[PDB]
Write a protein that binds this ligand. Structure first.
Ligand SMILES: NC(=O)c1ccc[n+]([C@@H]2O[C@H](COP(=O)([O-])OP(=O)(O)OC[C@H]3O[C@@H](n4cnc5c(N)ncnc54)[C@H](OP(=O)(O)O)[C@@H]3O)[C@@H](O)[C@H]2O)c1
Ligand SMILES: NC(=O)c1ccc[n+]([C@@H]2O[C@H](COP(=O)([O-])OP(=O)(O)OC[C@H]3O[C@@H](n4cnc5c(N)ncnc54)[C@H](OP(=O)(O)O)[C@@H]3O)[C@@H](O)[C@H]2O)c1
Ligand SMILES: [Ca+2]
Ligand SMILES: [Ca+2]
Ligand SMILES: [Ca+2]
Ligand SMILES: [Ca+2]
Ligand SMILES: [Cl-]
Lengths: 256, 265
């Protein structure tokens, strides 16, 4: 793929996301008085592909994905609303996740923090950006100096306590895409999700590559972008320590 | 106090908070340029400066008005003080230092002990939550209303899990819809005020962490009490909850069951 083609696609995605701005307030007003919001955003993206990129296929949360394989050369993975609980309960702290893979290789990635008007995007060969401003590799963060984010309700409490004690503090935004972007920005040392779907993490691959983040399974391997696996996205300086804590003493799972 | 006087004071405070753009952005810049070792010290220094400047603001506009804040001695501040401001110039210090986000300014005026004006300035998002007795509560001039009823099972809750025993934390997890944490008392409180969270707990706040919230709770029909359901002394602070009216009792029940929420030993 060329830089010229990537920019053309990028230009069309940024325009689509701007059109989304024109539709979403109405969908939100209807929801208020899974949602229609998730399903409509997804359907509109499907129409966008049908119109602009007829060869491209979609793996997304609100459709069946049985026909999506590693043979598909032009693939988008979408979470149309990541943070559905935050959308419904708070109307805040949710995002749109989009990622394009070409012959299996991450080429374009998007995390749109709509409520706060911040577009994180990554373009292979160009870099990562927040609202157009180039992002750089975050400063090194040792676990003891870093805030971490994970779901404490899906782990055994002894392991949750070990994570509390070894880190600087604990926070949770509650949307995978956003908690990940805080790692990307150097605000959090690490974000963990012990059982993500492909759409929860699809954009993050390219961000992790371009910003020198560690993004691995909880066993330290590369993740299958078609399947998802227990995962971490981490600053390079606290990745090993976090994995070590999670896997010590018989591991992080609930004994329950 | 008249609506005319409150507005005059309100207008002054809003203007002063706007002028805070001359201080805060510089501290934020320095969270990048100064070494890790000095960062909390820089924040506490700028906390002290913002506080002193508010002190001077009072001396010049409101000569009898006094100030209760962290960076000054408050030994002489009593229930005898007729005109009292309580201030947290930067609430959410750890978020400022580590994230340069999710921090706020807390300011509250009490007249003869009664909450009259309150401010939570979400500075990174430029969102001024303010409350005025007789007028109501506002976010950037959009008028806030009492939130919908939220039973605990349907609500997101926010608290510091590291300061409670884990059995009680588990009971809070199981009984609520979900768990979130912003990490600044003022902001986690405003999410309760907006109906985004069912409840926020802080088991050991200072007066300045919670001073604004009294008036917001009154005007928006929120329950704001000690963890044993009493009125909180605004001069002293206590273990506290701010909650939607429909999940207040259930949360307190969970916290106080089984010997309470404290850590063991
Ligand atoms: N394994 C984990 O680390 C984890 C993380 C979150 C949630 N959950 C599970 O989700 C159920 C209810 O929601 P919650 O409050 O825990 O999460 P949530 O707060 O509703 O969502 C938190 C984040 O995790 C995603 N998510 C939703 N369901 C998930 C699942 N089953 N496994 C992993 N991630 C998921 C969300 O994606 P969408 O908003 O697009 O759904 C969002 O990005 C729970 O019973 C819990 O087991 C597990
Ligand atoms: N529920 C609680 O008792 C509670 C709540 C928060 C923090 N803490 C403890 O205090 C320390 C600071 O927390 P952090 O590193 O997450 O971030 P933080 O920015 O220091 O504290 C988070 C929030 O609680 C306030 N705070 C600071 N020290 C506190 C204390 N001892 N008790 C209650 N509230 C406090 C903060 O106000 P300022 O930014 O003005 O300090 C902010 O509103 C840790 O040891 C933490 O576990 C306890
Ligand atoms: Ca979703
Ligand atoms: Ca998701
Ligand atoms: Ca505070
Ligand atoms: Ca403070
Ligand atoms: Cl907030």
């Amino acid at each position: 793929m060329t830089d010229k083609t990537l920019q053309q696609i990028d230009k069309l995605i940024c325009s689509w996301l701007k059109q989304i701005d024109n539709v979403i307030p109405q969908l939100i007003m209807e929801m208020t008085t899974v949602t229609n919001v998730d399903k409509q955003i997804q359907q509109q993206f499907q129409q966008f592909l049908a119109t602009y990129f007829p060869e491209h296929q979609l793996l997304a949360e609100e459709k069946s994905n049985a026909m999506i394989t590693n043979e598909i050369n032009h693939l988008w993975i979408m979470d149309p609303i990541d943070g559905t609980a935050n959308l419904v309960k708070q109307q805040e702290d949710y995002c749109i996740i989009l990622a394009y893979f070409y012959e299996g290789k991450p080429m374009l990635s998007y995390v749109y923090d709509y409520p706060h008007k911040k577009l994180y995007k990554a373009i292979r060969g160009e870099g990562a950006f927040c609202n157009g401003f180039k992002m750089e590799e975050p400063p090194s963060l040792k676990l003891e100096d870093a805030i971490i984010s994970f779901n404490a309700q899906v782990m055994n409490l002894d392991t949750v306590q070990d994570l509390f004690d070894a880190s600087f503090s604990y926070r949770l935004v509650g949307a995978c895409g956003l908690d990940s972007m805080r790692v990307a920005k150097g605000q959090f040392g690490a974000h963990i999700n012990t059982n993500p779907k492909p759409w929860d993490i699809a954009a993050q691959f390219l961000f992790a590559e371009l910003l020198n983040l560690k993004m691995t399974t909880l066993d330290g391997k590369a993740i299958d972008h078609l399947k998802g696996a227990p995962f971490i996205i981490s600053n390079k300086a606290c990745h090993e320590t976090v994995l070590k804590i999670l896997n010590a003493n018989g591991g992080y799972q609930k004994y329950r």
